[PDB]
Amino acid sequence: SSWWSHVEMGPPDPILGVTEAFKRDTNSKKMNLGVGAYRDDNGKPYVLNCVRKAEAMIAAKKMDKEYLPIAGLADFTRASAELALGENSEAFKSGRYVTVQGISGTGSLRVGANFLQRFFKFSRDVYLPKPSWGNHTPIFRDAGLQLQAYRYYDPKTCSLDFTGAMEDISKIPEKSIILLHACAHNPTGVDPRQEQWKELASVVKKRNLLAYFDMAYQGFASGDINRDAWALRHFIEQGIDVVLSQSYAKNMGLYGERAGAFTVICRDAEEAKRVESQLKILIRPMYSNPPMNGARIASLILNTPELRKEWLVEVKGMADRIISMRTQLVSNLKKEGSSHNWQHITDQIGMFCFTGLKPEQVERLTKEFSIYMTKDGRISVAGVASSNVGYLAHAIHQVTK
Amino acid sequence: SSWWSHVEMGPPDPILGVTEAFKRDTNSKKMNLGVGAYRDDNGKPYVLNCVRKAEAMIAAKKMDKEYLPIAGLADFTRASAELALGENSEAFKSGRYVTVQGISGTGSLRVGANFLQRFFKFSRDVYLPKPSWGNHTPIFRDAGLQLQAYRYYDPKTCSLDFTGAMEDISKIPEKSIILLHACAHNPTGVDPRQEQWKELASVVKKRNLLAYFDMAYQGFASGDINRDAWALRHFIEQGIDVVLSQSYAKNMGLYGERAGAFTVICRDAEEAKRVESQLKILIRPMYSNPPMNGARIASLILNTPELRKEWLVEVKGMADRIISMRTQLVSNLKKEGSSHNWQHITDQIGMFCFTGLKPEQVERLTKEFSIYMTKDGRISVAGVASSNVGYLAHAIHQVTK
Numbered sequence: 001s002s003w004w005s006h007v008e009m010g011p012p013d014p015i016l017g018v019t020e021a022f023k024r025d026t027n028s029k030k031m032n033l034g035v036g037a038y039r040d041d042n043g044k045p046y047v048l049n050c051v052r053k054a055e056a057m058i059a060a061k062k063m064d065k066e067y068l069p070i071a072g073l074a075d076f077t078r079a080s081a082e083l084a085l086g087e088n089s090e091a092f093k094s095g096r097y098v099t100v101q102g103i104s105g106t107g108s109l110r111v112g113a114n115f116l117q118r119f120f121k122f123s124r125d126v127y128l129p130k131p132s133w134g135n136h137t138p139i140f141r142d143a144g145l146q147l148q149a150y151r152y153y154d155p156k157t158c159s160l161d162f163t164g165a166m167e168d169i170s171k172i173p174e175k176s177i178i179l180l181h182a183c184a185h186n187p188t189g190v191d192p193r194q195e196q197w198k199e200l201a202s203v204v205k206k207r208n209l210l211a212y213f214d215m216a217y218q219g220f221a222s223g224d225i226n227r228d229a230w231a232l233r234h235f236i237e238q239g240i241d242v243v244l245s246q247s248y249a250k251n252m253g254l255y256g257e258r259a260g261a262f263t264v265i266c267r268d269a270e271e272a273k274r275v276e277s278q279l280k281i282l283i284r285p286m287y288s289n290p291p292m293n294g295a296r297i298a299s300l301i302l303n304t305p306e307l308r309k310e311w312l313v314e315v316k317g318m319a320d321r322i323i324s325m326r327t328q329l330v331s332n333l334k335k336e337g338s339s340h341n342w343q344h345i346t347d348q349i350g351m352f353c354f355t356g357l358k359p360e361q362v363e364r365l366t367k368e369f370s371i372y373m374t375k376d377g378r379i380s381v382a383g384v385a386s387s388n389v390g391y392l393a394h395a396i397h398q399v400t401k
Numbered sequence: 402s403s404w405w406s407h408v409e410m411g412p413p414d415p416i417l418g419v420t421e422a423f424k425r426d427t428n429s430k431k432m433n434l435g436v437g438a439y440r441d442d443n444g445k446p447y448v449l450n451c452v453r454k455a456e457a458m459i460a461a462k463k464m465d466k467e468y469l470p471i472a473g474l475a476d477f478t479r480a481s482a483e484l485a486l487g488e489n490s491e492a493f494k495s496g497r498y499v500t501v502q503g504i505s506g507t508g509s510l511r512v513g514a515n516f517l518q519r520f521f522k523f524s525r526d527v528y529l530p531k532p533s534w535g536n537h538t539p540i541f542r543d544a545g546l547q548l549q550a551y552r553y554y555d556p557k558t559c560s561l562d563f564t565g566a567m568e569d570i571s572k573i574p575e576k577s578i579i580l581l582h583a584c585a586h587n588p589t590g591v592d593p594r595q596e597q598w599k600e601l602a603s604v605v606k607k608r609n610l611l612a613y614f615d616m617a618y619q620g621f622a623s624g625d626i627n628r629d630a631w632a633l634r635h636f637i638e639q640g641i642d643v644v645l646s647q648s649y650a651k652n653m654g655l656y657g658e659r660a661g662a663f664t665v666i667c668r669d670a671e672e673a674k675r676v677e678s679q680l681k682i683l684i685r686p687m688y689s690n691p692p693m694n695g696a697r698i699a700s701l702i703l704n705t706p707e708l709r710k711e712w713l714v715e716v717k718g719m720a721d722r723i724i725s726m727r728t729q730l731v732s733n734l735k736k737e738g739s740s741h742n743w744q745h746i747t748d749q750i751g752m753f754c755f756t757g758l759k760p761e762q763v764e765r766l767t768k769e770f771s772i773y774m775t776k777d778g779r780i781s782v783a784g785v786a787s788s789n790v791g792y793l794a795h796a797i798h799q800v801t802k
């Protein structure tokens with residue numbers, strides 16, 4: 001009877017755990033459609049061109065590796081605030097915001113959730129859409145808050161339950177927290193229409209809810225960054241002080257370098273100055289200061305005009321390509337002879353497709369074809385290339401036949 | 402009355418907060434002697450030679466940036482386990498250990514403290530030496546445990562209170578947690594003598610305490626890595642299953658890239674397999690997966706024979722140099738005419754000197770001379786170069802005169 005004899009075997013991650021099993025498969029045809037990760041049209045990991053050149057300059061600069069302030073590299077801190085908010089922004093231009101570099105999206109989410117646990121004096125309830133990014137629960141639940149839900153997807157239809165959403169939303173108790181995904185809602189890929197968005201804006205403002213925005217896909221929903229941040233900016237200009245979390249994992253393909261940011265819209269510059277002090281104190285007994293390489297790559301790109309341009313050409317290139325694969329997917333399905341309606345594939349936006357497949361169908365895809373996706377039926381179309389679109393399609397067809 | 406109006410201004414970090422103030426000073430003679438950071442003999446940030454070459458190979462390799470498993474890069478994971486444990490080790494050779502890449506030392510400490518909060522069923526008490534690394538409190542206290550103390554320094558003497566230590570230690574309740582620093586106890590730079598260490602080993606084993614080892618300075622205490630890990634290995638071979646935290650911030654000068662590791666000595670390989678599962682689950686709702694660059698730099702050096710050799714030559718070079726500055730310090734003091742006994746400067750080991758200066762003396766050093774150190778009288782001698790040894794010495798003398 002040792003210290004840890006009582007410690008039982010936990011299960012593998014629901015998403016992350018899929019790459020671990022994918023890795024062991026010997027099928028030379030295996031496809032890893034589970035994590036949200038981008039592959040080029042040869043189905044190879046794609047390290048963006050502006051990333052490769054930003055590395056070379058850091059390199060060339062011969063930089064030191066000294067600890068960064070607890071809140072992160074300032075330029076990166078400020079360049080994100082601005083990319084999230086728009087440069088003309090009154091919030092941004094008044095300096096009533098505090099952005100802290102975090103350990104990507106996940107890590108900004110958690111510093112935030114931990115900020116709310118500690119200073120969000122009006123409620124312990126965080127309302128997540130139905131469904132949501134499976135990690136959002138444990139994020140919030142280990143942080144110390146309570147989890148709730150509001151209706152969002154309509155599986156009979158393959159779209160938003162806008163009536164059910166505003167019924168749940170207009171009834172959440174005042175001063176509660178509501179998580180809303182900026183764009184490329186995960187795992188559904190169905191976002192409120194701008195129209196829908198003005199209405200949610202109203203109810204949130206009216207019920208006085210703390211709006212927490214998750215923006216892990218900025219530029220993946222429409223292929224335009226500014227367009228993808230509309231919703232967030234529409235909120236803030238309606239006078240809603242939201243908190244937000246950003247990831248550069250996907251739009252800059254910085255996955256394992258981990259660069260991301262957590263921001264709070266405050267009342268004045270002075271309040272901003274005090275929420276910062278307190279966020280630092282929270283982050284010091286955590287990991288002390290943040291990972292420098294991603295932060296430095298991102299900043300040089302966000303802040304060097306030509307790198308900023310090259311990056312948007314490349315973000316667009318990525319969005320288009322997912323599109324081309326959606327398209328090509330539905331068509332081989334028809335071609336294979338599927339009888340099913342696959343229109344949601346092409347209708348959905350972002351890196352995934354919320355397919356509808358059941359678990360037995362997922363399970364045989366894995367086992368007869370070496371096609372790994374999450375058991376909720378989600379596949380990452382981001383990771384399909386010109387050369388296995390045909391394979392997936394036939395597989396999807398066989399197990400669906 | 403906004404969401405955050407009640408949020409008050411917190412104070413700046415006790416250590417980290419010193420670099421922030423140092424930064425603003427305009428004195429062309431300012432010295433930053435507060436964080437534990439290495440400067441070369443020109444008093445410039447030193448990016449080690451094996452680091453610079455390990456970067457070039459990664460570069461050259463054209464590597465991807467795909468997410469790393471939740472526990473980190475395997476090679477790095479395994480190379481640290483081994484650097485901490487020795488290759489002949491029965492623990493290591495039996496595979497009864499689980500090492501997880503963490504967000505440096507701070508970040509491994511916290512995943513660990515959070516592991517103990519969740520599975521350490523026998524106590525909520527962590528005993529820290531008197532004094533200890535100021536961040537150890539909030540680390541453990543935000544994690545959810547209780548803080549206690551055992552006597553360690555003897556300020557009348559400028560050494561260990563070994564009698565007072567074993568009295569407190571032999572009286573800690575059974576199954577409690579005791580933090581012990583591997584080598585280069587911070588902030589004192591006074592370590593148990595090997596002899597002392599065999600005795601502590603006994604009491605810990607005898608009272609059945611969970612020993613948690615902090616090893617942020619491996620190779621800084623004696624200039625030899627294996628020698629610096631004696632104590633930890635002596636423990637484990639006495640049959641004490643400790644947990645440990647490692648930082649590559651200082652011995653590899655990876656400060657802001659953040660590479661570090663948290664390890665648990667378990668009973669069998671199978672228990673190891675289950676503590677891992679559970680550590681992952683704990684880390685997924687935290688920052689999800691860890692920062693890749695430091696982990697990749699460290700691994701290539703730990704695992705490539707010539708990089709391993711070059712790194713130990715360089716670790717030694719660093720240890721010697723701190724020594725040369727201790728030496729040179731005491732001597733300009735004599736030379737300036739100090740009457741005081743400065744023998745502890747040269748007696749103490751690691752990156753610092755626990756000087757004895759009081760707070761008024763610290764305060765005028767900052768203000769008349771632009772010499773920043775922590776208010777506990779700690780200075781980082783690591784950061785003195787051949788060219789300002791004379792400056793510091795005269796300053797120390799003036800305010801001490």
Ligand SMILES: Cc1ncc(COP(=O)(O)O)c(CN[C@](O)(C(=O)O)[C@@H](O)C(=O)O)c1O
Nearest residue numbers: 015034035036104105106133186216247249
């Ligand atoms: C909606 C949402 N929010 C936050 C994140 C966090 O991402 P990161 O911490 O790397 O910056 C993801 C990534 N979701 C996944 O791509 C996915 O396959 O769902 C995957 O990255 C994951 O980490 O689960 C996400 O989809």
Ligand SMILES: Cc1ncc(COP(=O)(O)O)c(CN[C@](O)(C(=O)O)[C@@H](O)C(=O)O)c1O
Nearest residue numbers: 416435436437505506507534587617648650
């Ligand atoms: C005793 C101890 N344990 C853990 C750490 C954590 O370090 P890291 O998270 O970077 O890997 C430090 C660093 N202590 C300091 O150098 C110091 O001046 O005390 C400084 O790095 C700090 O972070 O406070 C330390 O001295």
